Symmetry: C3
Subunit: 72 residues, 3 copies
């Protein structure tokens, strides 16, 4: 999803800030960990959708396989 | 999986603790990075299973497509 | 992918270093957050490929379902 891409871009922005600050940092590290957690949660949501999409495709292919067996 | 949801909830708990501590913190940030890494590893395991599930569906649909071609 | 496994192993290495340093640490935490972000980005790439793989399987099964309907 574009949100995962948006959360990643925000993590990239915060990462550059934390590295530059390395060269207030602790707050940035904590915020960055929240940025990463949000990304992981968004990826989890899409991953869960693909899991259900795979099971629906499994059901559709099984119905076709059974139709072809039944036609014999 | 429910484990990924459990690892995420633990990361959410540790995140609230680190933010509240921001308002011992370093240990919490290190632990939180382990919580995130465990989540990423669990997501990787489920992602790998979906990759193999997709290839098995590909093989099943290909077998049906070939059966239908062969019947002609 | 093996890259995600390589990024994870690097995060595991950096995590052990940060925990041992807990027992220079800030640089290690920042680097570890970059290791995690890279993992999340790599997982996002594979996740996006599975999403497109699922839609192509959907199109293939739909074509078979339509062929079978049309043959009647």
């Amino acid at each position: 999803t574009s949100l995962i891409e948006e959360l990643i871009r925000r993590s990239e922005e915060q990462q550059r800030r934390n590295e530059e600050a390395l060269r207030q940092l602790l707050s940035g590290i904590v915020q960055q960990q929240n940025n990463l957690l949000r990304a992981i949660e968004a990826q989890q949501h899409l991953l869960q959708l693909t899991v259900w999409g795979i099971k629906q495709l499994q059901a559709r292919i099984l119905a076709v396989e059974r139709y072809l067996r039944d036609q014999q």
